[PDB]
Amino acid sequence: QVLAAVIFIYFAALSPAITFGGLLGEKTRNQMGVSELLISTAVQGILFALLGAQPLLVVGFSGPLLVFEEAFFSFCETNGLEYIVGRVWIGFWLILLVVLVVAFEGSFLVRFISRYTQEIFSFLISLIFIYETFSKLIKIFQDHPLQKTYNYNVLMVPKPQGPLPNTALLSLVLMAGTFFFAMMLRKFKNSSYFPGKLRRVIGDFGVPISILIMVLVDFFIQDTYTQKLSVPDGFKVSNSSARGWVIHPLGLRSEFPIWMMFASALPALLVFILIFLESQITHLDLLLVVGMGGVAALFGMPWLSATTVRSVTHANKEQRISGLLVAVLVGLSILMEPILSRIPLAVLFGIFLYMGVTSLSGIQLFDRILLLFKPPKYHPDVPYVKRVKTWRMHLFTGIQIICLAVLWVVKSTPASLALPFVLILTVPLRRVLLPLIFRNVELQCLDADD
Amino acid sequence: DPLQQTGQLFGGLVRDIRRRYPYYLSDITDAFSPQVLAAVIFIYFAALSPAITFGGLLGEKTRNQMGVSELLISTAVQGILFALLGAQPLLVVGFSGPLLVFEEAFFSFCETNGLEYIVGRVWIGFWLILLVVLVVAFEGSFLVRFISRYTQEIFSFLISLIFIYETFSKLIKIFQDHPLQKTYNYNVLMVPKPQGPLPNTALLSLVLMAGTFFFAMMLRKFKNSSYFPGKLRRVIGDFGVPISILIMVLVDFFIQDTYTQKLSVPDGFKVSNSSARGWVIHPLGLRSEFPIWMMFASALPALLVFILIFLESQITTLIVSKPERKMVKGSGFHLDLLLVVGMGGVAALFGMPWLSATTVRSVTHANALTVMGQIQEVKEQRISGLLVAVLVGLSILMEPILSRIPLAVLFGIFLYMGVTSLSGIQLFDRILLLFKPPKYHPDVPYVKRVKTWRMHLFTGIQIICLAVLWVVKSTPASLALPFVLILTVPLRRVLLPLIFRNVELQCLDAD
Ligand SMILES: CCCCCCCC(=O)OC[C@H](COP(=O)(O)O[C@@H]1[C@H](O)[C@H](O)[C@@H](OP(=O)(O)O)[C@H](OP(=O)(O)O)[C@H]1O)OC(=O)CCCCCCC
Ligand SMILES: CCCCCCCCCCCC(=O)OC[C@H](COP(=O)(O)OCC[N+](C)(C)C)OC(=O)CCCCCCCCCCC
Ligand SMILES: *[C@@H]1O[C@H](CO)[C@@H](O)[C@H](O)[C@H]1NC(C)=O
């Protein structure tokens, strides 16, 4: 049973890892791509299985880190600075910050983060995925428009340099099909058909089965082009003309400025905020995560977070061996270059939209947002309807919606590096400003801990 | 009882009239509701598009003896008269697939034997009128007492499956006409139709069909949901199919440079081949003399056509007028059979096609007028079918609005129609129960009082019958499909009691 459980924890680890880094590649001009994230996830999984206190957590790239990497990439492109050396110095500031945390007693702010901030954070991260996949679809339709005629001798060796006949519609079809198949396998896992063991096994592999089906569909279409996953053959870096394997803190093409080394403290404090929040939703493990992320930043490798996983690895000392096996197999996943380069990006974007929509379903803020449109006689048995009036809970949800709108406006500004600051500013809003608007009983009934 | 044998001649017809015609003012004023307008807009497309497709196919199979215009005019006139005079006004009278097979087979016979096709059709219609008057006089329609849920559900499931299969085959044909290629010809002529492969036509057709089906199903689910005010929710859910059609038509309208196949109607109210025939067919030949023997040899094709129309039309009437669908105003079988076959025979005199009651269209029309909430009641009237027939008749003059409707949107609508027509069939429920474990079977008598492997054996015998009927539909002896269906009537009554116990037979088969 252990040999079967390590197969399951592979694919559950594989599907975001091949997705996010691909996103990261398209967000970083392949300077920071699939291979860096895969090898970083492998080495950090090995080290976390060997040295971690709690092996129930798994380490991997997540959405908030991707948003921060895009914010820093836009910051560097606007200021003309080098990106990955700034990442190196942010990492150095992370080592010094976390060793100060160890020198102090610990993180005493764990009680200040409430259900308010976690709901706002998760609803913002789920809203980012849908926006990103729809923006990618719009970009594909802008690259290859629906025209009466096309130039049928375009050159495609670096990238398609002109419009193409059926690429945009096939990308839309692949995205919709992958999302639909993932949602229906998720439905089938909770249905009443088939034997229960076989139904649960099939529904547990909902993402890999949909991925395999859509990859087969695109593979058996011969003439139409669809953009594929950019994966190098071996242990090589994604963009060799951009950076080497080891990245010196001084400079690659231009030396790093004196001012931005000491000013690297300000973005590095926000990395620690983002790692702290999503590890709390899912301090020795925080030490290992931040320290390994800062060490891996020297090699141009991504920071990871702490995420929880289902009880399949609990049924596998045994759970530490399973983590080491899945980490070394994630390392060996880069060796399967042909079957990873035959995967379209539209399949991964359908999976991306599926993960966003699935992540929306467990949030009480989303439940109240749906409760805005229902009549008051259809509101459920939950205590925040029986003990809080409909107008008061609607005002509460409207305030949270206003906060989400403020966060989305700030993320759209050029100064989008201040998103963790504005999002941690909701704790002074909850602990100070909300008791002036609401009463007490409504406040312990709405964002009640559980 | 609506299915009884009285000794007085034309007794079933006069009692059908006496039981349905007092409800005429309620049949007029029961339609004053937005759901009836939504049903009109739904059934108009659902009855116009098969008329266009079958008229084009008929004009291809013959030498334009019977084209799109004749089918549209006949459908409009027969629908108007059947709505104004019928005993079951919720039936939809239109062309069907077996009728096309008979018309091409009879055209092949008349071309081989050198006879005139339309005059032979006229004499077939005369014999049809004679046999339907004789059958209604003898009250022969009571024979449909011998059609139980076995034959009804087998026929309804077969028709729904062929509908879904035909829609998917149309989509696959659209893919085959415009394949996914590396390169295309830029100057493809478009005047009769596209003469070659085109980019973005197959995939956009698939996207339009999928989007229309998805919007129809989501707006169906919104009707039974708990969101929005209840009145607004019911109004939006009632117009779910028109809203889906409008949304995807607007999506196709805002895409400029991509070709999609649009709905096309003939121009003007004229015959398809003015040289071959006029408006009125003379029964004593048109250019040559009509032989006397074929005047008497029309009895066998008239019997075949009467058997076809009788079985589809009466099994449709038993399906729509089931007691589980909460029909209260009453139905009619003798009057409906008399009207359908008599107007078919009269329309054959003008060269117009004869028509029958179609199962999928009539079930869709009744389902679009059923008030949900478990079924409370059905909005039954004579205005929705009359307006659908009138709009089919005026659809030639509706060219600027019908030229903007792509065929893929209607293909998604047809897929939605087939999927919703599967619901309500116990054979489909047992087919679904074949895949569920016995833990999750519902609280129905045929699960509680019947062992689960016996229920599965009953379902498997029905699947064997469906497969045999599908094979008969595939082979060129497709006109024997009703007769093979007749073979399911002794199968319930003779062979099944040898292998099943009596309580299991009244539990699995009921009324
Ligand atoms: C490769 C597999 C091929 C199929 C081989 C299938 C061969 C096969 O064994 O299945 C028989 C199975 C019935 O099995 P059976 O009812 O005896 O066993 C029950 C069943 O497994 C339920 O799913 C369980 O409920 P839950 O979910 O745990 O809550 C229940 O557990 P418990 O709670 O009572 O203790 C079990 O007792 O279902 C079918 O009849 C046809 C399924 C459709 C067959 C699909 C045909 C494609
Ligand atoms: C919810 C609704 C879903 C519906 C999906 C239906 C798919 C049917 C596919 C039929 C293909 C076929 O048969 O394609 C046929 C053609 C080749 O035919 P040819 O050589 O021109 O034949 C000419 C024959 N003549 C000469 C008689 C005219 O192949 C292709 O160009 C490749 C089509 C690939 C289809 C993939 C589309 C995406 C499907 C998955 C979406 C999730
Ligand atoms: C990274 O690769 C891209 C191609 O996607 C290239 O345009 C860019 O110049 C590379 N970055 C370098 C060389 O720094």
Ligand SMILES: *[C@@H]1O[C@H](CO)[C@@H](O)[C@H](O)[C@H]1NC(C)=O
């Ligand atoms: C009309 O009839 C003639 C003779 O049967 C035939 O040749 C012709 O194709 C038909 N159709 C048209 C449109 O003329």
Ligand SMILES: [Cl-]
């Ligand atoms: Cl049919």
